[PDB]
Write a protein that binds this ligand. Structure first.
Ligand SMILES: CCCCCCCCCCCCCCCCCC(=O)OC[C@H](COP(=O)([O-])OCC(O)COP(=O)([O-])OC[C@@H](COC(=O)CCCCCCCCCCCCCCCCC)OC(=O)CCCCCCCCCCCCCCCCC)OC(=O)CCCCCCCCCCCCCCCCC
Ligand SMILES: CCCCCCCCCCCCCCCCCC(=O)OC[C@H](COP(=O)([O-])OCC[N+](C)(C)C)OC(=O)CCCCCCCCCCCCCCCCC
Ligand SMILES: CCCCCCCCCCCCCCCCCC(=O)OC[C@H](COP(=O)([O-])OCC[N+](C)(C)C)OC(=O)CCCCCCCCCCCCCCCCC
Ligand SMILES: CCCCCCCCCCCCCCCCCC(=O)OC[C@H](COP(=O)([O-])OCC[N+](C)(C)C)OC(=O)CCCCCCCCCCCCCCCCC
Ligand SMILES: CCCCCCCCCCCCCCCCCC(=O)OC[C@H](COP(=O)(O)OCCN)OC(=O)CCCCCCCCCCCCCCCCC
Ligand SMILES: NC(=O)C1=CN([C@@H]2O[C@H](COP(=O)(O)OP(=O)(O)OC[C@H]3O[C@@H](n4cnc5c(N)ncnc54)[C@H](OP(=O)(O)O)[C@@H]3O)[C@@H](O)[C@H]2O)C=CC1
Ligand SMILES: CCCCCCCCCCCC(=O)SCCNC(=O)CCNC(=O)[C@H](O)C(C)(C)COP(=O)(O)O
Ligand code: SF4
Lengths: 51, 161, 144, 53, 116, 51, 69, 338, 64, 114, 54, 172
């Protein structure tokens, strides 16, 4: 249950900020941090739970 | 000889395919309405066991009911070729038969028989609902008789060879 | 080494398979490209110099099947085979580049250390057919 | 195009057709049968014969 | 040939080995994780029957629920892959050379390195 | 096998064989519950593969 | 690629002469450049495509290009 | 008599070609093509047939050869009545015969009947009718009295009888004709699809083949009609190059992308089985017998060059007919669009 | 009831992957031989989730 | 009129469906195109085992009749989805997706009823 | 004597036949036979007692 | 760009990516785009024959870039090679090269783009659309040609050839 709650906390992390960078308005910038966090947390939880 | 079994089975097959004769749900022009009129209660098609199917794969009859345009002729050819065999074609209306009112046009094909083999023709413009019913019933009778039209010859023992 | 010229695909393939060279240089030519005239001379000149390569010459016009079998796209074509396995391929006539490719292939083969009993010669199509059975056959069996 | 670069430069060799005279012999299945009967005999047949005796 | 206890004890870790072995495609790993949960389900039922343990028998539905929740999370992450611009085949998300892949090849998004 | 559809098919067959073992061991109720619970998962997996 | 265009003689081919000297009008030039693009699996920007005047320039551009297959 | 034929070939279906033609045996693979060759220039075409089942597309599509008022179908034809032939060719100045023993028939008596009796009666009817300017009988390449194949054995006698009855008859001897509805490419595709693992051969596959396109055959027929001097001579029609059966298999495999696999059945056992069991299109003794025999163009008679038709090479001609049946291996994402 | 505008519309931004067609849309030939179509309408429909997006009607199949 | 007063209409249609020829699209997968309907027919003709005609008048002594019904329905939905997918018609594929949505709704609805 | 099948195949056939015959023999003659296990070999009479040999 | 030819109308290379994890790209020049063409705005008016000629060259360039895809989808590669089709369409344009009206040229370019889009999207049939790609005086590559007429009328004027051929049915 606590692991599900922590996964909820990681899911609700803020992604996009209103910063002072005005150079990427019309270009695609790829950031994988969100997926990496979710992927590793999910699979670590799976391995620990099964074991 | 196989004829002993083939001939009665031929009769059964012809009867079954006559009883279940599903045309394709395909209408192009005013002749469509006449087809609908035959389908509806006043001249029920279902009495003679004809039920329309949307996909050509599940159709036995191709009702070319309406004018055929050059912009559509390849589509009609593709539909006819994609319809599963065995199949028959019934042209309905003057436009489907020989170009009808638009025989002198620059867009209309002068007859669906130029693109498709037409098994039967139903004259009219539009053909009456009873006219379409008559054409369908005549096509069914011809279809039933097509299996054995006395092609094979009888030998001295009256068995076809 | 001297260039062995073939006009029949069956004869050329049989000779190569029987010889089982460790290092082979196949030169495919057709009469449509004018540069084959100089390519033949370059190939002959390099054949004498390089004793470690079996130099084979094939005329695509006389052996149409050779083009398809060896996957020749443009000509003149030079193909380097190590134990009958494609190492490098050159398109066009350039003696310096051809000799450089021969030098690179031979030095790499010298550096290689194959396991004992597992370095026998293989026909050109064996690797392509293995990869085909591994990937393309399954793809076809899934789709169409 | 760089995604499909490998397919573009892949060298494909045309097939050579030969007649297969031993296709219907099913040599791989014959080998499987030989292995199966050898193992079956050595273990099950010996054990059964001794136990039956 | 094998007793059920040894068979299930072994195949659980065999399933884990398969999960690790297969190429890392998120959907495939999710299916393997589901299979692992079901192997645990079967093993727990076997031990519950052997030892007359209602707790072991009842672990079945707990495993089913945890597996369902994890599968829901996996579906969501697999869908999120699209918005994050990540290939489901994780091995294609990095430039490290891999001999296990026939056609892995990445170039810088340029047309000419030298202009003069 | 690397094809996702065949992987899912083999997972489904593995579920069937697990149910068969449970039936042989006489846990029929758990076999039925497992099958009903997991066939829906396989169905959703097929939809996900279509997507 | 040029072998398809039978107006030009590949034997005595000067890589510095213009397409017009080779015997190719604008349409023949456009067709030839498109064929070369197909052969090398590349795409010439509009400026360079219209700026090409002979085969030597095309050869140099393709040599500089790294995406050519 | 006069063999001259004045016709105009510059018109479309609605023109008046000037040819009135009766085409016996047009329900086969080549019948619709030959009929359409004459019909598309405005010629009148008659198709006498006694075919089962009547509703078959083979019979139905013959009406598309010429059009309305130009193509006629004569059903329930009797092949042993001279009056029937007289009626069929009464108004025809061209008489084409394609009535040959089918690949499905192994009975020597039936094969001889089809290949001799019908041909001789057609030739006799042409002789009786003085308005029949041209007769074009279709024989088979490799026809010989010593030929093991009953089809070829009877076809040699059939062509001899046709020449005897109508000395101005033109005899064609096509090689293995291929096309969309052929018995060669379609049979290859269907056999490989039904087995999925091999094509069953019954010989060493060294027999020579010289395939010719059906369009080329139709063009040859038109050129023969145009050329008056072609009357009374035998022609052998084939492709530019000669291939063995193994080479044909290799070419088809390379073109379609399907890996080749030939599974060998002993010739003797195959012959016994096919001659002692029921035979249909895909299982017949004629195919087994003709596998070993060579069906190529010999220099003993006139060739296609005499008719002035340049046949297309087999690799080029047969490529379009195998587009749908193509091996689906590794392909580019652009190619995935289809 | 809360807002759902963002779940209901998806605009396209210049050279943006997220604000773009991230899917291969279904280009269906609605008609002419379709029970719903009257018979001579060839509507090229761009479906995305079975929701119409783009219409390209061809109506010349009955021009006479 | 198919049989006196239409007494043999169903027999006629069944025989006609048998008679009608079939062709598999070249682009479609030959194996699956035929395998899916075969499995669907097997499942449909297995349906009747889960039926009772009296206090204990059943072909088999099954207890989990509702579980059997749910499993068989899920299998038939699987077959319909696979049919739509392997027949590459876009309309068929959309029909398969609709079948998936119907199955999703049926799960909860029938589960709550049970 | 001459045999198309190999000696090992003959041995396999013999041992398999012995297994089959011995299994059936022990199941048919060394069993209480109070339960109807082999149809057409055990009687199908109606038993009025708990133990009646079939 | 909100147009059928826009750089964002490419077909994605993957369900979750466009051709890469570090870049975004797609092919829309040699194949049809992802979204259908809902509107094709009229070519901006050309005030000069220079602009008209530029439009013609750009349209021909697009046609040449698309011809291999058209041939592959329509299964007409055997009839003619890609370069043969390009040269045949070049002859088609050459027959019209005498135009000197910018408005007429713009209208013609619009029609050409429309027909090219139809060929891409399979709106037309291969037999109906190959009339533009067919050789003017060369045999089709998938058929055996007849040189009987050339043999009979070798080294004879076109007038004499036509005189012998005729221009009217002789039956009536
Ligand atoms: C129950 C009582 C209790 C006791 C037990 C009793 C026995 C129980 C048996 C249970 C299993 C029954 C299975 C069969 C069910 C019914 C169907 C059937 O019979 O097959 C017809 C059926 C027709 O094919 P189809 O797919 O329906 O056709 C689709 C379209 O028509 C095709 O459309 P297309 O457009 O693609 O057309 C292409 C062309 C075909 O495509 C081509 O153009 C290329 C091929 C042309 C030549 C074909 C020659 C025949 C090839 C036979 C292949 C057999 C398969 C195995 C081959 C192995 C090779 C290593 O079309 C055709 O010609 C169709 C095929 C015609 C086949 C004619 C002969 C069929 C009957 C005889 C078969 C004998 C096979 C023996 C195998 C060995 C057995 C040990 O399928 C087959 O032909 C294969 C049948 C294989 C099993 C035969 C089982 C009976 C004989 C067993 C041996 C004797 C008994 C041993 C046990 C004794 C115990 C006491
Ligand atoms: C598909 C329907 C049936 C499925 C279920 C069947 C029952 C359950 C499974 C039982 C196992 C059956 C496996 C057969 C596989 C045969 C594969 C094959 O042909 O390989 C040939 C292969 C290849 O044949 P090859 O080598 O001649 O040809 C290939 C040649 N090269 C290598 C050059 C390419 O032979 C081998 O090398 C490996 C043979 C392994 C044989 C294993 C037999 C079974 C072993 C266990 C026996 C246990 C007996 C216990 C008895 C107890 C008392 C009763
Ligand atoms: C419910 C009804 C089921 C009916 C199934 C019938 C099975 C086939 C019965 C064959 C009977 C043969 C009787 C003796 C023949 C004597 C002639 C002879 O020469 O024998 C060798 C015959 C003759 O073939 P042949 O090619 O060797 O020689 C031709 C004959 N001569 C030489 C005289 C010209 O061949 C055979 O092997 C037997 C006949 C095979 C027939 C195959 C087609 C059967 C068609 C069945 C149609 C009904 C389908 C029913 C199901 C419909 C479902 C919708
Ligand atoms: C009381 C129970 C009543 C219900 C029983 C229902 C059983 C009906 C069985 C009908 C006959 C089916 C064929 C069995 C004979 C063997 C067939 C065979 O050759 O197998 C080879 C194939 C597999 O091998 P293959 O030859 O296709 O390819 C091998 C894999 N490659 C090529 C990549 C190396 O078996 C099948 O796939 C048959 C499937 C038949 C349809 C079954 C549908 C079941 C419902 C859906 C299950 C979940 C699917 C999820 C994934 C999406 C789909 C992929
Ligand atoms: C007189 C009264 C009765 C007496 C008892 C009779 C018992 C029945 C007969 C038993 C013997 C059967 C024949 C056994 C032959 C074994 C041959 C062998 O092992 O050679 C390897 C064999 C050949 O390889 P292959 O692929 O076929 O190619 C041919 C190459 N020449 O390769 C193979 O084919 C596979 C071989 C598999 C070997 C498995 C070994 C299992 C060993 C289990 C332990 C046995 C220990 C001994 C027990 C004795 C007890 C008394
Ligand atoms: N590969 C090829 O196609 C080759 C063909 N030929 C010759 O060209 C001819 C035409 O080619 P193709 O279409 O392939 O041949 P087919 O076998 O398809 O056609 C033969 C025609 O003759 C009819 N026929 C067969 N037997 C008889 C009979 N006893 N009595 C009356 N009519 C009969 C058939 O009608 P029905 O449908 O009623 O049986 C059919 O219309 C061949 O017959 C053959 O003689 C020569 C070399 C190669
Ligand atoms: C896929 C199938 C598509 C089929 C499309 C069929 C429809 C085509 C539509 C009509 C296209 C035209 O004719 S567009 C007609 C365009 N008009 C002109 O070309 C006149 C001005 N010409 C010039 O500037 C040069 O001659 C030039 C030849 C351009 C270059 O020649 P080089 O500088 O010497
Ligand atoms: S024949 Fe008459 S009623 Fe029928 S479609 Fe033509 S105009 Fe309409």
């Amino acid at each position: 249950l606590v692991s599900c709650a922590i996964f909820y906390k990681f899911i609700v992390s803020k992604i996009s900020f209103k910063n002072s960078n005005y150079k990427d308005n019309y270009f695609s910038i790829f950031s994988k941090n969100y997926l990496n966090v979710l992927f590793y947390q999910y699979w670590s939880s799976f391995f620990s739970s099964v074991m | 000889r196989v004829d002993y079994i083939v001939t009665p089975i031929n009769a059964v097959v012809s009867w079954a395919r006559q009883g279940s004769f599903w045309p394709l749900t395909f209408g192009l022009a005013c002749c469509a309405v006449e087809m609908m009129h035959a389908t509806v209660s006043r001249y029920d098609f279902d009495r003679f066991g004809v039920i329309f199917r949307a996909t050509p794969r599940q159709a036995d009859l191709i009702l070319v009911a309406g004018t055929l345009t050059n912009k559509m002729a390849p589509g009609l050819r593709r539909l006819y070729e994609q319809t599963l065999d065995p199949k028959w074609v019934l042209s309905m209306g003057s436009c489907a038969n020989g170009g009808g009112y638009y025989h002198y046009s620059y867009s209309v094909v002068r007859g669906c028989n130029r693109i498709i083999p037409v098994d039967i023709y139903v004259p009219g413009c539009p053909p009456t609902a009873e006219a379409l019913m008559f054409g369908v019933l005549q096509l069914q009778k011809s279809l039933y008789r097509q299996i054995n039209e006395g092609e094979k010859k009888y030998n001295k023992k009256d068995l076809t060879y | 080494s001297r260039v062995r010229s073939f006009n029949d695909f069956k004869a050329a393939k049989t000779y190569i398979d029987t010889l089982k060279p460790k290092l082979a240089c196949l030169y495919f030519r057709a009469d449509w490209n004018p540069l084959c005239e100089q390519a033949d001379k370059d190939f002959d000149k390099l054949s004498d110099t390089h004793l470690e390569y079996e130099f084979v010459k094939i005329d695509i016009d006389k052996a149409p099947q050779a083009k398809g079998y060896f996957a020749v796209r443009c000509e003149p074509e030079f193909l380097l085979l190590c134990l009958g396995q494609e190492m490098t391929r050159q398109t066009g006539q350039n003696q310096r580049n051809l000799e450089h490719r021969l030098f690179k292939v031979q030095e790499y083969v010298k550096g290689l250390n194959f396991p004992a009993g597992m370095d026998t010669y293989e026909e050109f199509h064996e690797q392509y057919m293995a990869e085909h059975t591994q990937l393309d056959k399954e793809i076809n069996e899934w789709a169409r | 195009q760089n995604n499909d670069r490998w397919v573009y430069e892949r060298r494909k060799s045309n097939f050579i057709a030969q007649v297969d005279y031993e296709y219907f012999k099913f040599n791989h299945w014959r080998t499987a049968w030989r292995y199966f009967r050898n193992i079956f005999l050595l273990t099950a047949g010996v054990s059964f014969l001794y136990n039956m005796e | 040939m094998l007793t059920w206890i040894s068979f299930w004890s072994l195949i659980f870790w065999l399933i884990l080995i398969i999960l690790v072995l297969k190429p890392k495609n998120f959907i495939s790993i999710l299916f393997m994780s589901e299979l692992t949960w079901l192997a645990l389900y079967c093993l727990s039922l076997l031990f519950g029957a052997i030892y007359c343990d209602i707790t072991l028998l009842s672990i079945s539905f707990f495993i089913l629920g945890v597996a369902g929740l994890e599968f829901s999370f996996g579906i969501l992450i697999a869908i999120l892959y699209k918005n994050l611009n990540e290939s489901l085949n994780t091995d294609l998300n990095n430039n490290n050379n891999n001999q296990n892949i026939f056609d892995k090849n990445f170039k810088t998004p340029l047309e000419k390195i030298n202009w003069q | 096998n690397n094809n996702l559809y065949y992987i899912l098919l083999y997972i489904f067959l593995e579920i069937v064989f697990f149910g068969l073992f449970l039936c042989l061991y006489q846990l029929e109720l758990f076999t039925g519950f497992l099958w009903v619970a997991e066939f829906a998962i396989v169905f959703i997996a097929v939809v996900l593969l279509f997507y | 690629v040029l072998s398809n265009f039978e107006q030009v003689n590949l034997k005595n081919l000067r890589w510095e002469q213009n397409f017009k000297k080779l015997g190719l009008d604008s349409l023949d030039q456009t067709a030839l450049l498109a064929s070369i693009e197909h052969e090398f699996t590349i795409l010439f920007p509009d400026g360079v495509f219209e700026g090409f005047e002979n085969l030597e320039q095309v050869v140099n551009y393709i040599l500089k290009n790294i995406n050519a297959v | 008599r006069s063999t001259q034929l004045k016709f105009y070939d510059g018109g479309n279906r609605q023109s008046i070609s000037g040819i009135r033609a009766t085409i016996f045996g047009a329900t086969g693979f080549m019948g619709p093509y030959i009929g359409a060759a004459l019909g598309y220039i405005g010629s009148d075409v008659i198709f006498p047939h006694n075919h089962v089942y009547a509703y078959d597309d083979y019979v139905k599509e013959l009406k598309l050869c010429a059009g309305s008022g130009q193509s006629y179908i004569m059903r329930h034809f009797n092949y042993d009545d001279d009056n029937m032939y007289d009626m069929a060719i009464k108004n025809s100045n061209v008489v084409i015969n394609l009535v040959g023993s089918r690949l499905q028939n192994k009975n020597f008596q039936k094969a001889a009947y089809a290949n001799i009796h019908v041909a001789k009666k057609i030739a006799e009817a042409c002789a009786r009718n003085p308005n029949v300017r041209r007769l074009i009988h279709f024989s088979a390449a490799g026809a010989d009295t010593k030929s093991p194949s009953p089809d070829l054995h009877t076809k040699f006698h059939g062509e001899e009888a046709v020449l005897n009855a109508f000395p101005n008859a033109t005899i064609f001897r096509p090689c293995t004709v291929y096309g969309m509805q052929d018995y060669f490419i379609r049979h290859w595709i269907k056999e490989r699809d039904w087995w999925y693992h091999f094509n069953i051969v019954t010989d060493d596959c060294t027999a020579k083949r010289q395939p010719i396109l059906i369009n080329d055959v139709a063009q040859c027929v038109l050129n023969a009609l145009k050329l008056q001097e072609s009357a009374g001579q035998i022609y052998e029609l084939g492709g530019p190059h000669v291939y063995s059966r193994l080479e044909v298999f290799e070419m088809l495999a390379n073109l379609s992308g399907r890996p080749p696999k030939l599974a060998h059945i002993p010739h003797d056992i195959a012959l016994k089985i096919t001659q002692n069991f029921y035979n249909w299109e895909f299982f017949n003794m004629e195919k087994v017998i003709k596998d070993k025999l060579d069906l190529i163009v010999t220099g003993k008679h006139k060739t296609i060059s005499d008719l002035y038709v340049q046949p297309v090479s087999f690799p080029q001609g047969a490529e379009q007919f195998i587009d749908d049946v193509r091996y689906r291996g590794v392909e580019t994402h652009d190619n995935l669009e289809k | 009831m809360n807002r759902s505008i963002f779940q209901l519309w998806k605009p396209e931004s210049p050279r943006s992957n997220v604000n773009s067609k991230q899917i291969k849309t279904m280009n269906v030939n609605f008609g002419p031989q379709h029970p719903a179509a009257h018979g001579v309408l060839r509507l090229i429909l761009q479906l995305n989730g079975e929701i119409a997006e783009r219409f390209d009607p061809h109506i010349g199949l009955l021009h006479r | 009129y198919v049989g006196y007063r239409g007494r043999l209409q169903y027999i006629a249609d069944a025989l006609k469906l048998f008679i009608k020829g079939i062709v598999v699209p070249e682009g479609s997968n030959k194996f699956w195109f035929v395998a899916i309907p075969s499995a669907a027919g097997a499942i449909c003709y297995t349906f009747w085992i889960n039926s009772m005609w009296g206090p204990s008048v059943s072909i088999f002594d099954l207890e989990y009749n509702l579980v059997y019904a749910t499993i068989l329905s899920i299998l038939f939905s699987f077959c319909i989805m696979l049919t739509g997918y392997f027949s590459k018609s876009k309309y068929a594929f959309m029909a398969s997706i609709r079948c998936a949505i119907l199955m999703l709704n049926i799960e909860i609805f029938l589960g709550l009823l049970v | 004597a001459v045999r198309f099948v190999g000696p090992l195949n003959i041995v396999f056939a013999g041992v398999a036949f012995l297994m089959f015959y011995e299994n059936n023999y022990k199941k048919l003659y060394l069993n209480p036979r109070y339960s109807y296990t082999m149809p057409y070999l055990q009687s199908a009479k109606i038993t009025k007692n708990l133990y009646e040999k079939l | 760009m909100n147009h059928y030819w826009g750089s964002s109308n490419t077909i994605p290379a993957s369900s979750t990516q466009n051709n890469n994890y570090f870049s975004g790209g797609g092919n829309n020049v040699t194949i049809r785009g992802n979204e259908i063409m809902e509107r094709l705005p009229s070519q901006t008016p050309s005030q000069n024959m220079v602009q008209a000629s530029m439009k013609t060259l750009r349209f021909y360039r697009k046609f040449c870039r698309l011809i291999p895809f058209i041939l592959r989808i329509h299964n007409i590669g055997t009839k003619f090679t890609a370069q043969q089709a390009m040269i045949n369409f070049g002859n088609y344009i050459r027959e019209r090269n005498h135009y000197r009206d910018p408005g007429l040229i713009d209208h013609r370019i619009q029609l050409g783009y429309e027909l090219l889009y139809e060929a891409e999207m399979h709106f037309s049939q291969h037999t109906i659309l190959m009339q533009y790609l067919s050789p003017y005086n060369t045999p089709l590559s998938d058929r055996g040609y007849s040189y009987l007429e050339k043999v009979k009328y070798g080294n004879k004027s076109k007038f004499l050839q036509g005189f012998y051929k005729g221009n009217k049915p002789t039956e009536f």
